Write a structure and sequence with these properties.
3 helices, about 25% helix, monomeric, hydrolase (phosphoric diester), Nuclease A, OB fold (Dihydrolipoamide Acetyltransferase, E2P), staphylococcal nuclease
């Protein structure tokens, strides 16, 4: 089973990336299973809804009383050294919240980190049915 662990917000970086203090070590976390429009995209830079996605993630984590990270069953860090996890703010998953608001798309996945793929898929479907942001 997966389990939530405490972490401390250091700095929100992008809609899909936040820096946290985890087990006394500062580290960058990439939100599992979601693709948000980027402000800091390597090529081209800022996309439509990039600033909106970043502000949403930032607002959600900064106003949170408790931040928790939930690693999945596969690899816990990507090739860039970023922790791969589901991030919770006062019990609500940031990953799902972004998708539900149509501020992120469920990323393509096939590796073992897919425990919440179905849950996210359902919220994404709802967001496109309601024609929210990205889905307009």
């Amino acid at each position: 089973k997966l389990h939530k662990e405490p972490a401390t917000l250091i700095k929100a970086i992008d809609g899909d990336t936040v820096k946290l203090m985890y087990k006394g070590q500062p580290m960058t976390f990439r939100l599992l299973l979601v693709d948000t429009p980027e402000t800091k995209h390597p090529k081209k830079g800022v996309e439509k809804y990039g600033p909106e996605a970043s502000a949403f993630t930032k607002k959600m984590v900064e106003n949170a009383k408790k931040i928790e990270v939930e690693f999945d069953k596969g690899q816990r860090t990507d090739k860039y050294g970023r922790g791969l996890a589901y991030i919770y703010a006062d019990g609500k998953m940031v990953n799902e919240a972004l998708v539900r608001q149509g501020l992120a798309k469920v990323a393509y996945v096939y590796d073992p980190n897919n425990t919440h793929e179905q849950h996210l898929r359902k919220s994404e479907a709802q967001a496109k049915k309601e024609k929210l942001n990205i889905w307009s």
